[PDB]
Amino acid sequence: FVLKTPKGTRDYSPRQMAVREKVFDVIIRCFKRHGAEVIDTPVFELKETLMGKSKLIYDLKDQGGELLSLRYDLTVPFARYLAMNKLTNIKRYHIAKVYRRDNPAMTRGRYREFYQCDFDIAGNFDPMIPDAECLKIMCEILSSLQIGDFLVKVNDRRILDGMFAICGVSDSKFRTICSSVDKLDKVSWEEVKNEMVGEKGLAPEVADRIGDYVQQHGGVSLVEQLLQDPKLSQNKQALEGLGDLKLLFEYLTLFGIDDKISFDLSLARGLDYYTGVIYEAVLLQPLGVGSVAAGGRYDGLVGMFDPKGRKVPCVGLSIGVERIFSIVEQRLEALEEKIRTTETQVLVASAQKKLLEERLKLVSELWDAGIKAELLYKKNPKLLNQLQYCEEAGIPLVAIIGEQELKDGVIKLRSVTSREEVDVRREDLVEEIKRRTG
Amino acid sequence: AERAALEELVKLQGERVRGLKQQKASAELIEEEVAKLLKLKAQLFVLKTPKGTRDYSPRQMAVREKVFDVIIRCFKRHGAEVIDTPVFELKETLMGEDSKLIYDLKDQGGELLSLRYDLTVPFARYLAMNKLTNIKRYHIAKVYRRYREFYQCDFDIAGNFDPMIPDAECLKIMCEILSSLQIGDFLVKVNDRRILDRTICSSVDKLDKVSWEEVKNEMVGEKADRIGDYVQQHGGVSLVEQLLQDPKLSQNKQALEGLGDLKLLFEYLTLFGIDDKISFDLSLARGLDYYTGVIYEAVLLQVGSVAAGGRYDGLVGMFDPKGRKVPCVGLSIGVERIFSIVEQRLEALEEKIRTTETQVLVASAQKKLLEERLKLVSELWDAGIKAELLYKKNPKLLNQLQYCEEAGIPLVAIIGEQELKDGVIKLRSVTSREEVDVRREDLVEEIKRRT
Ligand SMILES: [Cl-]
Ligand SMILES: [Cl-]
C-alpha cells in the first residue's frame, strides 16, 4: 500500500491554485457582469435520479441506506433543482467538479475528477437574444484570459437533420455519420469520406453530397447562400435553422463579436442533447490548436423531471477550464517566471537579537490596518535569511526594526528588488506601504 | 431550497433558545428568540437531494460569498498558501470515532475509495507524499460524514519553529475573522492536552454543556474528588500563574511542560491585543484524540461552537514510512452556522439581499428599439459595467421597472427615439425615480460614479 491520490485524481499545489484562482476570477467577473445568479448542488444525488442517463458512474456502497452517486454532470442536478423548486426560468452559473469512472490519460486532458464550468439561461424568451448573449459571454472571457486568438464555430441541430435527410442518410446511421463528420476539424475530408464509405457502408453518392455541404464554412454570407440553395429551401427544418442563424448573426453584429464567429456545417456534437444552435470555441495558431469552449440550446433536457412534461427552453455554454489552466501555467512556465503563491506585501524583520516581541507588536498593527504582513517564527532570525525568504516568496518589502531605529521611532523599509532603504515614521509607515503596493 | 434554508434557520434557533434557557437567561431575550423561532416555523416524483444534503440557493450563495470573502481576506492577509485535495481517498488511507461513519464507494472493479471525512488527514497525506516539513495554508472544501455533506474551513501551519508564535497567530486569526463577520460578541477558550493528562474527558466535554452538580452525578454514574477541583477553574493569565505554583501539578514534568508553554503564549496574545478575548478553561477536552498540544474553541456570546482547533504533531508522522513527526498547529471555522446567523442578521435589518450585482438595466418604453438596446448593453459590457436587458422585442416600461425593484438594480437606462437622435440617454434612479439626460459618451463614466 502506497500513499497516493486515487487513480484518476490529483492534488492542487499552491502554484496551481494561484493559476486556477487567476482564471476563475476573470470568468466569474464576466458572469457577474452579465447579472447571473449562482447555485450549488451536492456532490452526490440518489441513483434513481441519474439512471437512464455511458454508465461510467461512481456509486457509493449501499451501507444499509439508499444508494447515492457522485455527480457525473452538472445539468441533471440543474434539472432536478428547477423541477424541485417549481421554476421554469433562471439565469445562473455553476462551477464544480464532476466524477466519471473512465480510463485516465494524464498526457491527454482526461482525469477522473475534473472541474466543469457552466452558464445557463432557461426560460421562454424572444428567439435568439439569450443565445447571442451566450456567444458574447464566451468571447468576453476568452478575450480577457489572453491565451491567444480564438474563433467560435457555430451550427444548428436542425440544419444537420435536414441536410442529412435531403442528402440521404438513414435515420439510425445518422448519429454515426455525424460522429464521422465532426472530425473534419482535426482530419481531412478525403479521410472521413474513406472512413464513412469504407468503415460504415454509406453509399459514395450520398457521401459526396454530404461533402459538398460540410466542406463549407464562412460568415452570414453562407447562411444567405444556403437560404438560396434549391434543395435546402425545400427542407422545413433546415429552413428553421437557417432563419435562426441569420437572426443570430445580426445580433452578434450588434454585439461586435461578428468577426470572431464562423458558421461551419462540419460541426456536429451532442445531438442527443442539443436542439438548436451548437457552438465550439477553439484556439488559433487560422488553424485550431484545440477546443476550449462549447455551447448549445437544449430545450428538451431541462423539463424531463417535471411531472407534466413541460419543456423549459434552455441555452448555455461550458468553458474548458481544465485546458485553460494548463495553457496559462505553461505560458508562465515558458517564460519560466516564478508564480506567487502568497499575497504578502511586507515582512517584519530585525537585524539585532532580542527584538522579537517588538516585531510582534508591529506585525499586529499592520494586520489591524488590513495590510498583509508576515514574520518568521524565530527568536533571533538573521537578516540575510529573512531576505532570501522574501526573494523566494516575492515579498516586495521588508520592515526592519532596530534599537537605533526604534529610539528614533522610525521603521526602516527596504525594497527587496532595489535593496534601497528609507526610514519612515510609525504613523506614516502604514500609508507608505499602501502607496508602494496597491 | 429556500425552504431548506428556513429549516436550517429553525434548527439553529431552537438550539439557541435551548442554550439560553439552560443559561438561566432573562425572559425578555428568551421571548424574542422564541418569537423568531415561531416565525421561522410558520415560514417553513419524490425528487429530493440525498438525505443530509441540501442545495444552495442564489440567496444562500450570496451569504456564503460574503462570509467566505471575509474569511479568505484574513487568510491571505496572514500570507497563507492554498491547496486542494480530491473528494475521495483510498479507504486504507483513512484509518485510526467510528469507522462506519465514513462514506465508502462501491467496488467498481478498482481500488476501494472513501469520501473525505476530515480535511486534515488529506493534508497529512499531502505533506508526506511531497515530503514537506514546513507549510502555511488554508483549505475550504466540503467534508462528508454519515447535514452529512458540509463545508469545512481550515487554516494550518506546519513545521518546527520557536515555541508559541505559530500557536499565538492562529488565535489572532480566529479573533480577526470573528470580529470581521460582525456576528456579535464572542469568546475563545484555550487548554493544553499535555496538562490534562477518556470517559472522564467525555464527561468533561459533556461538562461544558451541563452543571458540575449534575455533571458530578454523571461522573459517579459512569464510575472524582481530586478531579473536580481542577475542572471547574477557568480564566485568564493570572489564573494560569497560580496553577504552576501548585506543588502537585508542578512536580509532574508531563503536566508541567504544558503549563509553561501556555504561560508563554499569553504574553504573545497580549502583544496581539486579543488577550482580553481569550479564556482559560481546563474543562474543555474536545478533540482530545487528535491533539498533542493546545486546544482552542470559540463560542459566540448571546453545539454552539463556531471555531475550533489546536496543535497536533502525531498525524503527519503517521503517513511517513520513517514515522518522523511533523509539528503542526491549526484551526477549523464552523462556517455553516455562521452562514445561518449572518443571513438571519441581514433579515433583521430588512434590507434586501441581492442575488445579482447588475448595476443597470437597458430599457425602452417605445416599440422596435431592441437592436438599439442590444448595441448599448454591449457597449456597457465592454466597459466592464454590469448591465442587463430583457429578452423581449417590445417590453413595457412598467414591467422593466418592476424587475429592477425586485432584483435590487440601482439604475435603469432608457432609450427613446428622440433621445437616440439627440445623442442623450435617459438615466432614472429606481429608488428616487428621478431622471437625467446624459450624452452617450458620459454614460459609462456617470454610471460608475453613481454606483
Ligand atoms: Cl466513431
Ligand atoms: Cl479501475
Find cell 497525506 and name the residue.
B125
- Judging by DSSP bridges, how do beta strands A217-218 and B278-281 pair with one another? unpaired
CB pairs under 8 A between A and B: 211
Q: Order of strands across the sheet with A90-99? A: A37-38, A90-99, A113-122, A314-319, A288-297, A277-284, A150-156, A261-264, A217-218
**Does residue A364 sit in the same domain as residue A260?**
no
What is the distance between the alpha carbons of residues A109 and B264, in angstroms, rounded to a whole number? Answer: 52
Computed from CA positions of residues A259, A264, A269, A271, in that sequence, does the dihedral angle turn out positive or negative? positive
Chain B residue whose CA is closest to A36: B356
Distance from the alpha carbon of residue B115 to the mean position of ligand 2, in angstroms: 17
- Judging by DSSP bridges, how do beta strands B360-363 and B186-192 pair with one another? unpaired
User: Is A74 annotated for ligand binding?
Assistant: yes
Q: What number of CA atoms fall less than 13 Å from residue A378's CA on the CB side?
A: 14
User: Which positions ≥6 away from B354 have C-beta within 8 Å?
Assistant: B62, B407, B408
Out of B302, B324, B348, a domain closes at B348
Q: What number of CA atoms fall less than 13 Å from residue B242's CA on the CB side?
A: 9
What is the distance between the alpha carbons of residues A196 and A186, in angstroms, rounded to a whole number? Answer: 16
CA A374 to chain B, closest CA, distance in angstroms equals 6
DSSP letter assigned to residue B101: G
Find cell 509607515 and name the residue.
A429
Ligand of minimum distance to the alpha carbon of A7: 2
3-class DSSP state of A351: coil
Write out chain A residues lying below 8 Å of B110, CB-based: 7, 101
Q: What share of chain B is helix, strand, coil (3-state, %, to 5)?
A: 50, 20, 35
Domain-located, residue B38: no
**Does residue A25 sit in the same domain as residue A77?**
yes
Distances (CA, A) of A427 to A369, A373, A432: 11, 16, 9
CA B181 to chain A, closest CA, distance in angstroms equals 15
Ligand of minimum distance to the alpha carbon of A175: 1
Contact B101, A128 (CB under 8 A): no
Q: Which residue in the set A46, A61, A374 is minimally distant from B104, CB to CB?
A: A61
The verdict on a CB contact (< 8 Å) between A126 and B86 is: no
What is the distance between the alpha carbons of residues B392 and B396, in angstroms, rounded to a whole number? Answer: 9
Question: DSSP readout, B135-161?
Answer: EEEEEEEEEE----EEEEEEEEEES--
3-class DSSP state of B200: helix
Of B282, B286, B191, nearest to B233 (Cα)?
B282
User: Which positions ≥6 away from B422 have C-beta within 8 Å?
Assistant: B437
Q: Indicate the Cα dihedral angle B132, B82, B178, A359, nearest 10°.
A: 60
3-class DSSP state of B304: coil
Q: Is B185 exposed, middle or buried (0-12, 13-18, 19+ CB in 10 A)?
A: exposed
User: Is A273 annotated for ligand binding?
Assistant: yes
Out of A302, A323, A339, a domain closes at A339
What is the distance between the alpha carbons of residues B178 and B335, in angstroms, rounded to a whole number? Answer: 11
Q: Which residue in the set B45, B80, B382 is minimally distant from A342, CB to CB?
A: B80
Q: Which residue type does A414 have?
A: R
Of B369, B353, B357, B356, nearest to B419 (Cα)?
B369
Of B271, B87, B325, B285, nearest to B190 (Cα)?
B285
3-class DSSP state of A409: coil
Write out chain A residues lying below 8 Å of B49, CB-based: 41-42, 45, 84
Q: Which residue in the set A13, A35, A99 is minimally distant from B357, CB to CB?
A: A35
User: Which positions ≥6 away from A174 have C-beta within 8 Å?
Assistant: A161, A164
Distances (CA, A) of B14 to B30, B52, B53: 11, 18, 20
Distance from the alpha carbon of residue A19 to the mean position of ligand 1, in angstroms: 35
**Does residue A101 sit in the same domain as residue A222?**
yes
Contact A241, A156 (CB under 8 A): yes
**Does residue A195 sit in the same domain as residue A290?**
yes
Contact A293, A280 (CB under 8 A): yes
Provide the angle, in degrees to the nearest 10, between the axes of the packed helices A14-33 and A321-335.
Answer: 130
DSSP letter assigned to residue B383: T
Distance from the alpha carbon of residue B95 to the mean position of ligand 2, in angstroms: 22
Chain A residue whose CA is closest to B264: A357
- The domain in which residue B423 lies consists of 360-450
Domain-located, residue B160: yes
Chain B residue whose CA is closest to A1: B92
**Does residue A235 sit in the same domain as residue A345?**
no
Which helix (H) or strand (E) is A94 found in, with range? strand A90-99
What is the distance between the alpha carbons of residues A78 and A94, in angstroms, rounded to a whole number? Answer: 9
Contact B160, B176 (CB under 8 A): no
Locate all alpha helices (DSSP H) within B89-192, ordered by sequence. Answer: 120-130, 165-181
What is the distance between the alpha carbons of residues A159 and A142, in angstroms, rounded to a whole number? Answer: 27
**Does residue B250 sit in the same domain as residue B103?**
yes
Chain A residue whose CA is closest to B379: A255
Of B273, B272, B278, nearest to B238 (Cα)?
B278
Contact A348, A355 (CB under 8 A): no
User: Which positions ≥6 away from B142 have C-beta within 8 Å?
Assistant: A43, B87, B149, B150, B151, B152
DSSP letter assigned to residue A60: B
Chain B residue whose CA is closest to A129: B391
**Does residue B152 sit in the same domain as residue B62?**
yes
The verdict on a CB contact (< 8 Å) between B105 and A58 is: yes
What is the distance between the alpha carbons of residues A241 and A159, in angstroms, rounded to a whole number? Answer: 5
Contact B114, B89 (CB under 8 A): yes
Of B82, B68, B173, B177, nearest to B136 (Cα)?
B82
Q: How far apart are the first and last CA of chain B?
A: 31
What radius of gyration do chain B's Cα atoms show?
A: 28
Domain-located, residue B15: no
What radius of gyration do chain A's Cα atoms show?
A: 28
- Judging by DSSP bridges, how do beta strands B328-333 and B278-281 pair with one another? unpaired
Contact B20, B33 (CB under 8 A): yes
Distance from the alpha carbon of residue B109 to the mean position of ligand 2, in angstroms: 6
What is the distance between the alpha carbons of residues A336 and A170, in angstroms, rounded to a whole number? Answer: 54
Find cell 429549516 and name the residue.
B7
What nine digits make up the cell of A282?
Answer: 477553439
Residue A295 pairs in a beta bridge with A279, A317
Domain-located, residue B48: no
What nine digits make up the cell of B367?
Answer: 416599440
Ligand of minimum distance to the alpha carbon of A192: 1
Residues B8-42 as b/e (b if ≥16 CB within 10 A, e otherwise) read: bbbebbeebbebbeeeeeeeeebeebbebbeebee
**Does residue A254 sit in the same domain as residue A351?**
no
Q: How far apart are the first and last CA of chain A?
A: 49
DSSP letter assigned to residue A185: G
Write out chain A residues lying below 8 Å of B76, CB-based: 342-343, 372
Probe site for chain A from B6, B381, B447 (most A CB atoms < 10 A) = B381
Find cell 433562471 and name the residue.
A90
Residue B115 pairs in a beta bridge with B88
Write out chain B residues lying below 8 Å of A4, CB-based: 90, 129
Contact A370, A420 (CB under 8 A): no
What is the distance between the alpha carbons of residues A70 and A74, in angstroms, rounded to a whole number? Answer: 11
Which helix (H) or strand (E) is B370 found in, with range? helix B370-382
Domain-located, residue B253: yes
What is the distance between the alpha carbons of residues A79 and A312, in angstroms, rounded to a whole number? Answer: 9
Write out chain B residues lying below 8 Å of A81, CB-based: 1, 55
Domain count, chain A: 2
Contact B65, A40 (CB under 8 A): no
Domain-located, residue B75: yes
Ligand of minimum distance to the alpha carbon of B113: 2
What is the distance between the alpha carbons of residues B36 and B32, in angstroms, rounded to a whole number? Answer: 6
Of B190, B296, B282, nearest to B232 (Cα)?
B282
Domain-located, residue B98: yes
User: Is A111 annotated for ligand binding?
Assistant: no
CA A130 to chain centre: 19
Tell me the CATH number at A412.
3.40.50.800
The verdict on a CB contact (< 8 Å) between B55 and A4 is: no
**Does residue A424 sit in the same domain as residue A437?**
yes
Phi and psi at residue B15, to the nearest 5°: -60, -45
Which helix (H) or strand (E) is B410 found in, with range? none
Distance from the alpha carbon of residue B110 to the mean position of ligand 2, in angstroms: 4
Contact B190, B280 (CB under 8 A): yes
Of A93, A114, A109, A21, nearest to A328 (Cα)?
A21
**Does residue B321 sit in the same domain as residue B421?**
no
Q: Which residue type does A202 have?
A: L
3-class DSSP state of B426: strand
Q: Which residue type does A5 have?
A: T
Phi and psi at residue B75, to the nearest 5°: -65, -45
Of B259, B264, B268, B312, nearest to B169 (Cα)?
B268
What is the distance between the alpha carbons of residues B165 and B393, in angstroms, rounded to a whole number? Answer: 64
What nine digits make up the cell of B200?
Answer: 472522564
User: Which positions ≥6 away from A76 have C-beta within 8 Å?
Assistant: A45, A49, A50, A53
Domain-located, residue B47: no
Q: What number of CA atoms fall less than 13 Å from residue B296's CA on the CB side?
A: 28
CA A333 to chain B, closest CA, distance in angstroms equals 19
Contact B373, B364 (CB under 8 A): yes
The verdict on a CB contact (< 8 Å) between B77 and A367 is: yes
CA A261 to chain B, closest CA, distance in angstroms equals 16
Q: What share of chain A is helix, strand, coil (3-state, %, to 5)?
A: 45, 20, 35
Question: DSSP readout, A125-151?
Answer: -STTHHHHHHHHHHHHHHHHHTSS-EE
What is the distance between the alpha carbons of residues A238 and B57, in angstroms, rounded to a whole number? Answer: 40
- Judging by DSSP bridges, how do beta strands A217-218 and B435-439 pair with one another? unpaired
User: Is A75 annotated for ligand binding?
Assistant: yes
What nine digits make up the cell of B298?
Answer: 470559540
Phi and psi at residue B422, to the nearest 5°: -80, -10
What is the distance between the alpha carbons of residues A167 and A211, in angstroms, rounded to a whole number? Answer: 10
Which helix (H) or strand (E) is B260 found in, with range? helix B253-272
DSSP letter assigned to residue A186: T
**Does residue B339 sit in the same domain as residue B413?**
no
Probe site for chain B from A13, A24, A38 (most B CB atoms < 10 A) = A38
Vertex A302 angle, CA A297 and A305, to 5°: 165
Distances (CA, A) of B131 to A285, B137, B317: 40, 15, 11
Which helix (H) or strand (E) is B11 found in, with range? helix B2-22
What nine digits make up the cell of A381?
Answer: 532570525
Tell me the CATH number at B213.
3.30.930.10
Distance from the alpha carbon of residue A102 to the mean position of ligand 2, in angstroms: 8
Q: Which residue in the set B149, B176, B388 is minimally distant from A367, CB to CB?
A: B176
Out of A339, A361, A382, a domain closes at A339
Of A180, A141, A177, A171, nearest to A295 (Cα)?
A141
Tally Cβ neighbours within 10 Å of residue A234. 11
**Does residue B164 sit in the same domain as residue B239?**
yes
Residues B195-233 as b/e (b if ≥16 CB within 10 A, e otherwise) read: bbeeebbebbebbbeeeeeebbebbeeeeeeeeeebbee
Of B74, B96, B89, nearest to B119 (Cα)?
B89
